[PDB]
Symmetry: C2
Subunit: 329 residues, 2 copies
């Protein structure tokens, strides 16, 4: 009824060789913890208890003990959690926290392509604009073109959402031809149709890798970890009004390749944003936009001293042009 508390049962098994290959196909997902870390230890144990009846295995591979198995799987960062799914290895870079860890695994455990088979599902599909989407129309699951799409979906999972329909009327409502795939940028209404349908998986993966930095995109707790960062609480009238300004500059510079704004809602990352306040020495719980140096963590911020008078889209774009050209950093 209330919140789960860890019961003491040790579910994080230690994985040796020979024991390895049996457990990779017993489960959908394997969580491998590569080796004072009682905080990271106890989070992994509580997630394993809540998911003890999901098809997810929780193991730990010691750096010194199973150094054989860590070299066999390519474990670089010690103290990091790696997710194995079939032939693929996913390094978790999010916050090592029970909320964030559960959501990542449950995103990863499902099929990488969500199938839309109803016309009423198309309206809800079209209104969801916060992430990159792809959608295709195929004859059936057995098709080589769906398989290529399915294989491409697996390569980007769970960071980019893939969709398919097998219905002529649904595809008619999406204005999709047979074996065609539409690409949706975040916060833009009109999709991009990938040229020269039908597509192989190498054609799809190469298209998505070119289009991986859209003009505006929303940070997620899954996908994370020079850099233009915008801060706006959508739940706050101030941050929402600033977010609406950011959307207008995103739709005015779809031509501009040197513009990629990362919007961070502080309500989605309350611990991370508060910590960055200590690093960036600015109030990030009100509308802000800045550029951050990846190395030195230096930053310069647009002057928004007065949130009852936020910049217009022309003033944001002019500030952006001064930042891209070279104002300070």
């Amino acid at each position: 009824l209330n919140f789960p508390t860890y019961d003491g049962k040790d579910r994080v098994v230690s994985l040796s060789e020979k024991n390895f290959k049996q457990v990779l196909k017993k489960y959908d997902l394997l969580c491998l913890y590569y080796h004072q870390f009682q905080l990271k230890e106890i989070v992994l144990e509580l997630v394993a208890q809540v998911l003890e009846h999901k098809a997810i295995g929780f193991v730990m591979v010691d750096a010194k003990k199973e150094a054989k198995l860590a070299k066999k799987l390519g474990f670089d960062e010690e103290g990091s959690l790696y997710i194995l799914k079939g032939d693929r290895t996913i390094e978790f870079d999010g916050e090592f926290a029970a909320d964030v860890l559960v959501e990542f695994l449950l995103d990863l455990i499902e099929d990488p392509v969500e199938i839309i088979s109803s016309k009423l599902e198309v309206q809800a599909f079209e209104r969801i604009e916060d992430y990159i989407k792809l959608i295709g129309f195929f004859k059936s699951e057995d098709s080589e073109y769906y398989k290529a799409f399915e294989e491409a979906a697996e390569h980007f999972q769970p960071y980019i959402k893939f969709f398919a329909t097998f219905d002529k009327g649904v595809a008619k409502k999406l204005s999709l031809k047979m074996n065609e795939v539409d690409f949706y940028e975040p916060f833009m209404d009109e999709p991009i149709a990938i040229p020269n349908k039908p597509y192989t998986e190498e054609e799809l993966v190469e298209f998505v890798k070119e289009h991986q930095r859209p003009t505006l995109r929303r940070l997620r707790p899954e996908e994370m970890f020079i850099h233009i960062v915008a801060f706006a609480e959508k739940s706050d009238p101030d941050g929402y009004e600033f977010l609406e300004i950011l959307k207008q500059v995103a739709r005015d510079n779809t031509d501009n390749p040197d513009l990629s704004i990362l919007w961070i809602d502080p309500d989605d990352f309350p611990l991370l944003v508060a910590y960055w306040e200590k690093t960036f020495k600015i109030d990030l719980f009100r509308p802000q936009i800045g550029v951050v140096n990846v190395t030195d963590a230096d930053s310069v911020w647009m002057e928004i001293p007065d949130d009852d008078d936020l910049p217009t889209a022309e003033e944001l774009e002019d500030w952006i042009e001064d930042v891209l050209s070279g104002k300070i950093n």
Copy 2:
């Protein structure tokens, strides 16, 4: 740049008497931990570290030692976190986690009334529909009627959001008369004006307490802890399409006082929803609506076996009527 890690410094002080009243006025907020709990110990220490330069004090009150101070403040649940703000006592009932705890305190630390002073902020105010809102128009902060609204806002903090404007043009755009207060239900566009303005604080608090159970409302990680609960991932076309049906049933029974739907997005509560799957024996990460018994934790769920054919609002409403009238429990 990356995530904060706890540095070893012990900031959770132990608070005695006489030392008490100095630290209550030294700080804006007092976080009191009432007494194997190394998990709760380490979460509180990281939050105190991240917030070490905020006007927030972190203390712990042992049940047996400072039982004097625990009796003086009224601490019932051991292992619970209580937030003190001036004359007010707030028991934290949410997940004992750094993300949820940080967001709660930063919600509590700000002024309970957010002032809107720009007409462009009014459009953004109107699009934020996920929580109860109140907004009033007063002459200035010095007015006795603003003081009553501010005192009412402090009384519901941080669970219900209060707003005020002091500007004639903003109020005209809000269609607010002077000292008038509008009441906003979640997911309903038209506010309710509280009758017989101007209002005392008792007049406002009593109005809000009658109207605290609206037809549809979204759970928050702050405010939480017979009951119709709906499960819908807004980020998923299935869950979004289901969310759109609930809004339609919400607008059809604004008359019905015995209808109060709690929408829980599984993406907002990944640990709690996965845990409830084990208690309710249902896949809650797809569209669901059920009624839960508060005592026995029994539940009965509307049958949604086929997510390509979700119920319409009439079918939801008919299911609701069988549940309110008496179908099963």
